Every structure is written in structure tokens, then in C-alpha cells.
């Protein structure tokens, strides 16, 4: 790999900054937000960087008042290489006090599809959770109500604005269905053309060309509720998600036009049932897929990005530990994820961190950390 020749870089500092910190992000309306969850990140064909999050306005809960907040890098051409090279909060959407979540954005050219979840504020996934008003939640259910909703909006001038979210809900989600989730994290743009957006049970799937997209569903026996895709060097389609235990990923591989193989458990690949991120980073010699989730069966903070040369990402290596470049005052680092391929050849990753003030209760601060490194940096690791 000629990539270990590189001399290795990272940095690394928090991007979402938790109610608590010192430069905690607020929207230019003034309001904030408790924690921020839920990272989704993408390199546009501009080179300018989004990054999505969950503003989690009262607690780092995963329902209740939530927004889908965000911030660009200021220019095309900077790649987020420090705290400078970032434009000040902004939200997609917010409306209403339920639930807007999930982030999971696809580039396509240019336009760039931003997928969402959505719940009305009076629901949560158990039901019986007590809201800041102390209003008890009812359990997301299968009535138009009270299920889990799909929306995608849309942004063709570099995320600068964003469409009104369109509720997609009975067009790509199955009827009957409660709970859903899509991502979080990150669609794929395939070699041949097609989008295809990892989602609960399912891909949905974007055909046609540019400027002129059709979504159908692929329906995936057996597949998590977050769910990562990519393109392995062979041409085909790859599924690596969440475990609905803890243990290890569960991964799947197949192609839009024949379906794919049943899940199974990667033992290679451990997992504390959290959501992971899987990035392809080149088609040359020689083919590399990314992944990045916490290695461990029972906790989220032992974070290890990976690099596989197999041509369906059978095997990784050992990778490396995020905490050989600790972030210090931005909480204990470990969770969610999404990464992204700059425009000068660095993986940008977002990270979940937690201060853990409150320890696993409602009121511990959640910040995002931006990371980039490259791949040199992942190969000169101690124990890879
Ligand atoms: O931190 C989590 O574990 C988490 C955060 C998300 O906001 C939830 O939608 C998601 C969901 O609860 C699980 O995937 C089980 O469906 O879990
Ligand atoms: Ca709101």
C-alpha cells in the first residue's frame, strides 16, 4: 500500500459543541440545543463538506424535540482542516416539537438528497418516557400518527438551502410498519449510476440519471434497523449493520438486480449494538473499503477505523484506535459515526462523544468531534 509512504497526519477537534461548552452552537435565531447525536457527514463535488446532526434541544434523548441542524465548511477548497474552516450552525429542518433524525445524505452530481426520520413529539420508540413538560409519551405505533415517518429534502446549491422535506413515507417505507430508521450516515452513489440509501429492512434505491431520480425499495430479509452500503471492489453491493443484540456487525452482500444473501454475523468485526460507518475510499490499486465503528461487544468507546483489500471486504485489518489521537474537554469519545473522503485524499470522519455528567441518564452532554487522517496514519498504527 503506497499510501503508508505518506508522513501521517490527523487532527482532530469538536465540531458540535454540547450546551455546556464554551462555544456551544446555537442557530442565529438563539435557540440551542442540549447535545448534539446522530452525525452524517458528505464531501460535495464541489469539495465543500456538510456535516448533519441531531440538535437535541432538551436532553440527549432520542425523541422529543429534535432538529436537523448542520454546517458547511466556509469554502469548496478548505477540506474542515480547522475550527476556522467551518460556517456557524444552521438547521434543515425543525418544525414542530416531535422528531427529526436520522440523518443519511447521498451526493448525486449538483444536488445532494438528505434522507430523514421523523416521529410526532408525543410518541418515543418504548412509549412512557416523560417529556420536559411532563407529558408521558405513547409508543410509536402503525397509524399515519404515530409510526415512524420517511422525508427527504433536497439541496442543489451546495447546502446552502434546503427543499421542504416531502413526506415519502407510503411511497418507501412498507405499509403496516411502526418503528423505521434510514442510515444513519450516508447513501452511495454506484459505479453504474444508481443511489442507493441504506435504511431499516431495506435499500432504497435511486434510479435514473442525474436531475431525474426514481426511488423504489429493495427489501432485505433480515437486516438491521441502521444499516451502512457500500461498493466492494468487485461491483457488488455490500450491507454491514448494527446487531439487534450486542456482539458483532451482521453483514450481507448482493446487487440491485438479483437481491442479496441472508445476514450473518462477521466475527472479525465486533460490536456493542451502535451504529457503524463504512466508507468506499478508491477503485484503483489497490481497492480500498473503510470502517469505522466501536470494536467491542459492550462498549461504544473503543472506536477503530479499518481498512479491507478484499475484493467483497471479507477481512480488515486491525485498523487503529481513534484514542491514539484523544480530543481532550469535548467528553469521552465513542458512538455514532460517519465518514467521508475529502478533496485532499483524508478520511473526514464525524465521532459521537459523550461528558458523561449525568452518567447513562437523559442529562449527560453529547458533543460531535471532526476528525481527519490519512490512510497513512490508519497503516502506521501500533498493532496494525
Ligand atoms: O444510541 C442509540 O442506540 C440509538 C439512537 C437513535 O436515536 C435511535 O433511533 C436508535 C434506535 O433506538 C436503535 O437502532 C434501536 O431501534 O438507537
Ligand atoms: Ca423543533
Keep these: 500500500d503506497p499510501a503508508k509512504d505518506a508522513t501521517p497526519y490527523h487532527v482532530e477537534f469538536p465540531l458540535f459543541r454540547s450546551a455546556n461548552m464554551a462555544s456551544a452552537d446555537k442557530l442565529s435565531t438563539g435557540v440551542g440545543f442540549h447535545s448534539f447525536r446522530i452525525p452524517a457527514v458528505v464531501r460535495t463535488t464541489t469539495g465543500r463538506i456538510l456535516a448533519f446532526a441531531e440538535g437535541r434541544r432538551h436532553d440527549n434523548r432520542d425523541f422529543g424535540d429534535i432538529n436537523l441542524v448542520y454546517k458547511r465548511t466556509k469554502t469548496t477548497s478548505d477540506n474542515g ?11 434543515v429542518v425543525g418544525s414542530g416539537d416531535g422528531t427529526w433524525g436520522n440523518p443519511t445524505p447521498v451526493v448525486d452530481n449538483g444536488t445532494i438528497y438528505l434522507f430523514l426520520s421523523w416521529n410526532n413529539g408525543s410518541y418515543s420508540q418504548k412509549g412512557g418516557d416523560e417529556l420536559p413538560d411532563g407529558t408521558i409519551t405513547k409508543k410509536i405505533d402503525t397509524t399515519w400518527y404515530g409510526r415512524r415517518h420517511l422525508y427527504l429534502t433536497t439541496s442543489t446549491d451546495d447546502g446552502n438551502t434546503w427543499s421542504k422535506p416531502q413526506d415519502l413515507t407510503k411511497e418507501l417505507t412498507p405499509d403496516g410498519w ?7 450516515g450516508n447513501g452511495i452513489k454506484l459505479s453504474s449510476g444508481e443511489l442507493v440509501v441504506p435504511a431499516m429492512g431495506r435499500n432504497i434505491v435511486g434510479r435514473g440519471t442525474p436531475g431525474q431520480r426514481t426511488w423504489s425499495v429493495q427489501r432485505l430479509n433480515g ?8 461498493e466492494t471492489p468487485d461491483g457488488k453491493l455490500y450491507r454491514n449493520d448494527r446487531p439487534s443484540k450486542a456482539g458483532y456487525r451482521i453483514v450481507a452482500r448482493g446487487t440491485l438486480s438479483d437481491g442479496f444473501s441472508d445476514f450473518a454475523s462477521d466475527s472479525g468485526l465486533p460490536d456493542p449494538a451502535c451504529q457503524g460507518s463504512v466508507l468506499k475510499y478508491n477503485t484503483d490499486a489497490p481497492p480500498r473499503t473503510i ?17 479491507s483489500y478484499d475484493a467483497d471486504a471479507a477481512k480488515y485489518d486491525y485498523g487503529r484506535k481513534l484514542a491514539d489521537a484523544p480530543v481532550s474537554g469535548a467528553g469521552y469519545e465513542g458512538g455514532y459515526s460517519s465518514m467521508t473522503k475529502t478533496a485532499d485524499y483524508k478520511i ?37
Design 81 to 91: 482542516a480547522t475550527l476556522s474552516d467551518w460556517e456557524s450552525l444552521r438547521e
Design 178 to 184: 411502526s418503528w423505521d430508521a434510514v442510515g444513519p
Design 223 to 230: 437486516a438491521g434497523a441502521e444499516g451502512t452500503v457500500c
Design 291 to 307: 470502517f469505522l465503528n466501536s470494536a467491542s461487544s459492550d462498549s461504544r468507546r473503543q472506536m477503530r477505523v479499518r481498512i
Design 348 to 384: 473526514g470522519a464525524l465521532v459521537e462523544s459523550d461528558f458523561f455528567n449525568d452518567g447513562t441518564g437523559g442529562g449527560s452532554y453529547r458533543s460531535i468531534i471532526w476528525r481527519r487522517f490519512n490512510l497513512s496514519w490508519i497503516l502506521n498504527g501500533p498493532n496494525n
